């Protein structure tokens, strides 16, 4: 519902600044700070989504190594 509405306009905030990383440390640093909301929110997002955003789970993985370059690159 309203719910998954928001959290997918997050999904495609980062690929915008991740697009760059020419500032890189200004850039995905804060990066960090969202996957880190976005476990601890996953179940408080509503009742307990559990199954419906454990799709999130899985693309959200990757969104954190392919982060770990984009640090310097």
């Known amino acids: 519902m309203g719910s998954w509405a ?9 690929k915008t ?5 020419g500032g ?4 995905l ?3 960090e ?11 408080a997002y509503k009742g307990k989504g559990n199954p419906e955003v454990e799709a999130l789970r899985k693309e959200a993985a990757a969104i954190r190594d392919e982060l770990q370059a984009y640090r310097h690159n």
Not at 6 to 14: D, P, S, T, V
Not at 17 to 21: G, M
Not at 33 to 43: D, G, M, N, P, R
Request: hydrophobic fraction near 55%.
């Open 6 to 14: 928001e959290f997918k306009q997050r999904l495609a905030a980062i």
């Open 17 to 21: 600044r991740l697009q760059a990383l």
């Open 24 to 27: 890189s440390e200004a850039e």
């Open 29 to 31: 640093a804060a990066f």
């Open 33 to 43: 700070k969202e996957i880190a909301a976005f476990e601890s929110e996953l179940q």
